[PDB]
Amino acid sequence: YDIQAWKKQCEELLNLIFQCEDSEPFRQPVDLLEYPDYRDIIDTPMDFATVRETLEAGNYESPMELCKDVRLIFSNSKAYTPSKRSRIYSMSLRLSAFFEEHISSVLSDYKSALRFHKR
Numbered sequence: 001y002d003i004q005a006w007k008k009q010c011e012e013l014l015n016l017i018f019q020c021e022d023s024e025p026f027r028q029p030v031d032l033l034e035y036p037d038y039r040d041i042i043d044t045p046m047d048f049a050t051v052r053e054t055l056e057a058g059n060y061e062s063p064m065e066l067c068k069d070v071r072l073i074f075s076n077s078k079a080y081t082p083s084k085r086s087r088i089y090s091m092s093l094r095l096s097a098f099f100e101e102h103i104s105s106v107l108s109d110y111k112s113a114l115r116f117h118k119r
């Protein structure tokens, strides 16, 4: 019933993601010199370094807010890809399955801790 435990759990999950080869296209902001039309398609850029910085600055109040920004990385890849068979989109799909399998328990434990506090 530890209400603060999600923060270290999210830091450790981001460490695993940065070790995965599939995260390489998503670690830093998409390079606008390599992809000059990117901001004609994508309104709100997001990347894992920005998520980690926001966490470490104390600017997430809940793991749900972190989960919204990581899901934006994946939805931006799906909206920008020219093919649902592309290399970089195929990487985003595998990474999203890994993220979703690991974030599940973080969110369940946090919500359980809040309910116990409110009891």
Ligand SMILES: O=C(O)c1ccc2ncsc2c1
Binding pocket: 025, 030, 035, 076, 077, 078, 080, 081, 082, 083, 086, 087, 088, 089
């Ligand atoms: O060139 C592609 O296939 C492609 C697909 C998704 C994507 N997400 C950020 S950069 C990028 C490039």
